[PDB]
Design a protein around this ligand. Structure first.
Ligand code: PRO
Ligand code: PRO
Ligand code: CL
Ligand code: CL
Ligand code: CL
Lengths: 475, 474
């Protein structure tokens, strides 16, 4: 059971929710965590969804080495292997922080003709980047997928950037039921070396902080010229390829926990629940023990015929109430209870994890009714989170409105001139003002742009505003 | 491929893997990029094995790749991040055991907590490889590693054998590679384990056995080291009985070696990223769409029967070049479509393993190909199975060893299972080859021939316990 309240000590609540649901075991090396099966199931669900979808686009999986040489890599985040035993290595080598400099010389070799394009590769793997750490959200080693494509034209690459971003929106919004906002990163927050970076952003109300949930980069021709990735044209001329890079990590899991967890623990959206329905037989004295177990197995068969993922917790060595607490901590969306009274009526009692509402459902009606309940729960998790997001964003016009909004734990949407030095000035000014990390930075320039009335000044510099921009305190 | 597989096998292997586009080289020695043509085979066997161990209640997990100095008291030391030194150096994991088993000691308290069954899909780094080659001797490789804890030895041993059977199916049903189940000798088992089981394969071209996968009955020794104890139903503290089991991308190497021929790779249809390559008979600048349009219609029809299909419509290569290209990659089936094929409603299909050709009506295309594919798969297995049984000589005395070794064979010999005799045999077989390469045990096969009363060990003279399989090996 969880005892910390989510709206009181949020970080203690998070620690308790992920430990007591058996998702995480803490580790002696700061920022590394053991990922226990209950978490890994969710990761497998979202991985299967994303892997199928990118296969439909013609992306093929591959595996590149986890080590990278000093020359190919050339910064402060990179872990260096420098010794073997007590002897120093002749040349130190790095553990991959990301694989651009690992794959792209191979791309340079593999690409000769426009007939070789597009090249579309993806890798499921872990990476290492070395603030204070948080399980799932900021860890030193994390699991991810990284996709890397090369195209003959820029327009084709950008289309792929946007298709991938849409997939990431589905990953968060259709699987995890986490609303996100699509936008571009500012020039100082984008991938180093790339042309343009797009992103989905999520919000965490309890601390009012924005978090980058996934990114899709138009690399353009910048890496192509640094790695000499050229192809021959139909015309016969040599051209640089146009590249994209895109990645998504186990941060998504943390975002889901924070988004849907409550004072009793996890709430797992049915689309990623390894167990959607847990069937709990109520055995007390020997009150029709075998008939109960048999009817439970029947119900499991019947529900699996509608592709519902069902476990029967018929373990002897635990009490039913213990089983209720266990699967509630764990976040299983639906609990089905069956006792001698329930066998007598031809019904079963069903409790939704998200709200606690109980239903008596006859056996014949179980499958369609539970499908309806699961779709209701998924949709309701999403809509409540989306409402919290809508009320977490203040639209403002001048700098004076910023500190009040931030202190309500809100994001700000403000007209901005998009000058890069102004972002640094704003970060430092908001840090200083919050003293009396507290800094506000750009989360993204949203795709969905309100109208910009003629003569709207930048909310900070007074120069003409270019676009509406989403700022907040960040992860 | 110019090297001949029976005549210069090392060379044949290197040429065949590179010309097949399965791997790419890298600027850090011993590391190889797995390109999709090979990674897809990994993905298929991974999915099969993972489905089957999930049917057993094994669940996947992830453990960090670093180990502290504190917890370790020939490791790779990470000592800096950026230009900044770490306060204390950390290390890259030597074992996963050293990270998982303290966690196991924490998680297991009561008989209620058993059995615990975990698996990890990950990569592994080994820093001392002698001279590298793809899939066999590499600085980094992929694998799965399963670790379980049970309340009794019988349950753990049951799982050891169930996993071994899954491994047999991995090799034999996916990769069409025949393997032999057995238990390792005392001198070749996992160090602190009770019993190690193995599937073994055989490479006829150099006559070497190669270990395909291992499933260990660890017993209670690791439980004693790490204090993985549980309280049983009567209140007593007992030690858990552990198992571990693993299998690696070396499996891909063994498939190459088994099925490849002088033209190059032959990939079993069950795991081939492309099962059917469609080759339009065209030449540059001629494309009117008639031939490519029919090729696309055929692709759609074959994909409806869940056949994995690729069309090679590249303009700059002649059809002969493409035939050679896809044969060197080892696509099981090629479908040639040209002007007469079009003008008569047929297609010409060629099997990669035998070179036999079929003129097939478009209507019959999808059924027939399914048939062809299953045939190819079965044929690949049974031919290899025959080679395996022709490579094993059943002997009785040491006198027969050196001849059999020189026929590039394995020997099945009655043995007293004394470990020192195993190391003596390694030394002598080795000295004899030098004067003309050592011969070790591969396994004691589960399938034991009858042992006539009073048979003596082929080397020591003492009473024989069991028939043991010996050979040179990888
Ligand atoms: O690390 C990143 O952000 C990009 C996207 C995935 C690969 N590299
Ligand atoms: O190295 C081995 O053979 C065993 C397999 C699982 C982990 N360790
Ligand atoms: Cl653009
Ligand atoms: Cl069950
Ligand atoms: Cl020799």
């Amino acid at each position: 059971m969880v005892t910390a309240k989510k709206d009181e000590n949020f970080s203690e609540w998070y620690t308790q929710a992920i430990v007591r649901s058996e998702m995480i075991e803490y580790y002696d090396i700061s920022g590394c965590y053991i990922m226990r099966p209950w978490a890994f199931h969710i990761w497998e669900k979202v991985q299967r969804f994303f892997d199928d979808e990118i296969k439909k686009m013609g992306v093929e999986n591959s595996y590149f080495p986890m080590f990278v040489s000093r020359h190919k890599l050339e910064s402060p985040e990179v872990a260096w292997v420098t010794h073997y035993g007590d002897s120093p290595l002749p040349e130190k080598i790095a553990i991959r922080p990301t694989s651009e400099t690992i794959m792209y010389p191979a791309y340079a070799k593999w690409i000769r003709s426009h007939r070789d394009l597009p090249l579309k590769l993806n890798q499921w793997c872990s990476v290492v980047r070395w603030k204070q750490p948080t399980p799932f959200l900021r860890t030193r080693e994390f699991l991810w997928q990284e996709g890397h494509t090369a195209h003959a034209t820029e327009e084709e690459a950008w289309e792929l950037v946007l298709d991938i971003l849409e997939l990431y929106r589905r990953w968060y919004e259709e699987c995890l039921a986490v609303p996100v906002i699509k936008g571009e990163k500012s020039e100082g927050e984008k991938f180093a070396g790339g042309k343009k970076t797009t992103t989905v952003e999520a919000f965490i109300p309890e601390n009012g902080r924005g978090i980058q949930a996934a990114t899709s980069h138009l690399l353009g021709t910048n890496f192509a010229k640094m790695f000499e990735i050229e192809f021959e044209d139909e015309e016969g001329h040599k051209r640089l390829v146009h590249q994209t890079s895109w990645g998504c990590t186990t941060r998504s899991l943390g975002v889901m926990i924070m988004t849907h967890g409550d004072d009793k623990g996890l709430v797992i959206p049915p689309r990623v629940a390894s167990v959607q329905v847990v069937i709990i037989p109520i055995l007390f004295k020997d009150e029709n023990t075998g008939e109960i177990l048999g009817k439970c197995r029947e119900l499991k068969t019947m529900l699996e015929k509608a592709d519902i993922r069902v476990r029967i917790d018929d373990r002897s060595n635990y009490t039913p109430g213990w089983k209720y607490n266990h699967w509630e901590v764990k976040g299983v969306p639906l609990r089905l209870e069956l006792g001698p009274k329930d066998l007598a009526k031809g019904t079963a009692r069903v409790v939704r994890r998200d709200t606690g509402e109980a239903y008596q459902i006859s056996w014949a009606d179980l499958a369609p009714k539970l499908l309806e309940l699961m779709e209701g729960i998924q949709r309701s998790l999403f809509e409540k989170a989306k409402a919290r997001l809508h009320e977490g964003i203040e639209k403002i016009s001048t700098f004076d409105e910023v500190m009040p909004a931030l202190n309500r734990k809100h994001l700000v949407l403000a007209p901005w001139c998009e000058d890069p030095e102004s972002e640094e000035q704003i970060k430092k000014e908001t840090q200083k003002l919050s003293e009396i990390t507290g800094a506000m930075k750009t989360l993204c320039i949203p795709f969905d742009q309100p109208p910009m009335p003629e003569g709207t000044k930048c909310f900070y510099t007074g120069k003409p505003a270019k676009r509406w921009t989403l700022w907040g305190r960040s992860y």
